[PDB]
Point group: C2
Chain length 114, copies 2
């Protein structure tokens, strides 16, 4: 292969995890995680700050059960996944893209940091 | 802080890099990088990543060395920006961003 696709986040859940059971019986967790930053603007010397929101999708059964058991709004976690951008079509036939951090079955890491 | 936003990729440029001078006078590089994964049930899936580099020392590396096909390692941060389409509707685009003075890039060929 000769490639690597790895996202590592440490952040806080913006809301309680969303756990759904797909028609197949498979569980999936969706999380929304906040990461943030501060810095001096180099030209204005103003102090700046920016929060980034990340959509996490977890298919790994072990980690779903961890999320299910332990995670709530405000929980701080470490997570490792892969970036996947899915392509879809809205009502108008227009192509749309959604980028997610995906923890596939047998992959990914989640550590509770609280 | 108590937070971290880090993406690490190794992959190949899917096109020659794009280098531009913004109105501030700063330079920016846009690259597009493929990573891939194989599996059976033999299938391949290529993931395309859109990289924006504001770090001017790393823009110079892109300019002086990188071309279509080049294999690189890059460390950056995920940023999702908002924009409006032709009909005024909100849309979103997620990019791996290397801000001024941040990020890493190593040529691997």
């Amino acid at each position: 292969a000769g490639s690597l696709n790895k996202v590592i986040l440490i952040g806080n859940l913006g809301a309680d995890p969303e756990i759904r059971r797909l028609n197949s019986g498979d569980q999936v967790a969706n999380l929304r995680i906040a990461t943030s930053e501060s810095w001096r603007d180099r030209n204005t010397n103003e102090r700046k700050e920016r929060t980034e929101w990340h959509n996490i999708v977890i298919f790994n059964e072990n980690l779903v059960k961890v999320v299910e058991q332990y995670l709530k709004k405000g929980s701080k976690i470490y997570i490792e996944g892969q970036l996947q951008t899915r392509k879809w079509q809205d009502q108008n036939g227009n192509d749309r893209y959604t980028t997610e951090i995906v923890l596939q079955k047998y992959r990914g890491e989640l550590q509770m940091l609280d």
